[PDB]
C-alpha cells in the first residue's frame, strides 16, 4: 500500500492547499477581541519546487467572507461576516 | 456565498489535516542526499481548540511509506521507499 512516486510528486508540487490560518495574522488590529474559531481554513500557497533556489509564491489572490464569533470581555458576543485573503494560483520564483 | 459559522468551526477544530511536510526536518541525519520531491503530503494534527491555552496534539499515530527519489550528486539517482509518521487522532491538551 506504498504511495506511488508520481502521485507523491503531484500532491507535493507548489499549489494552493487548505491551510488553517490564525485570525490574529489577518486582523491583528482587532486586539480587544477573542475570536471563535481562533483560526480559519483558507486556500494558501504551499508545497515544494523542482529546485531549492525556488520558492512557492501566490500569483492570483481573492477574498472569501466567513461568519466568525467576536467576543469582547465585559461586552457580550456576536457573529459577524469577516473577509479573508485566499491564493488561487501559485508559481515557483527565485528567492529575492 | 458566505461560509456559515458552524461549517467554519467544524472545518477549523483540532483534527488531522493534509500538511506538506519538508523531508529535511524528518530525516536531518541524511545531509549528503537531495530529495525529489523535497516535501511530502502527511496527515498532521492541525486547527484550533475552544480556548488558547489548549494545543492540538496527536494521540493515535502510524507510518506511511512513499516512493521518493534519492540523489547523491555525481553518483546517480534512485527511487526508494521512505517511511513518514502521520497522525490518525488528535486531542486538545493543556500547555
Amino acid at each position: 500500500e506504498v504511495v506511488k512516486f508520481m502521485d507523491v510528486y503531484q500532491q507535493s508540487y507548489c499549489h494552493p492547499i487548505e491551510t488553517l490560518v490564525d485570525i490574529f495574522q489577518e486582523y491583528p488590529d482587532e486586539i480587544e477581541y477573542i475570536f471563535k474559531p481562533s483560526c480559519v481554513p483558507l486556500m494558501r500557497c504551499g508545497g515544494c519546487c523542482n529546485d531549492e533556489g525556488l520558492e512557492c509564491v501566490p500569483t492570483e489572490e481573492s477574498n472569501i467572507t466567513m461568519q466568525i464569533m467576536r467576543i469582547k470581555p465585559h461586552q457580550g458576543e456576536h457573529i459577524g461576516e469577516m473577509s479573508f485573503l485566499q491564493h488561487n494560483k501559485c508559481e515557483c520564483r527565485p528567492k529575492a | 456565498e458566505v461560509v456559515k459559522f458552524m461549517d467554519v468551526y467544524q472545518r477549523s477544530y483540532c483534527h488531522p489535516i493534509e500538511t506538506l511536510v519538508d523531508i529535511f526536518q524528518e530525516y536531518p541525519d541524511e545531509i549528503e542526499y537531495i530529495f525529489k520531491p523535497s516535501c511530502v503530503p502527511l496527515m498532521r494534527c492541525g486547527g484550533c481548540c475552544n480556548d488558547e491555552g489548549l494545543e492540538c496534539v496527536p494521540t493515535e499515530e502510524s507510518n506511511i511509506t512513499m516512493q521518493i527519489m534519492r540523489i547523491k550528486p555525481h553518483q546517480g539517482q534512485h527511487i526508494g521507499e521512505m517511511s513518514f509518521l502521520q497522525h490518525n487522532k488528535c486531542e486538545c491538551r493543556p500547555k
Binding site: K36 | Y9, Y13, C14, C49, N50, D51, L54, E91
Partner: peptide
C-alpha cells in the same frame, strides 16, 4: 459540554 471536546450550539448559549 467539556472544553477539551469538539461542537453543539446550545455550548456557544
Amino acid at each position: 459540554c467539556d472544553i477539551h471536546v469538539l461542537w453543539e450550539w446550545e455550548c456557544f448559549x
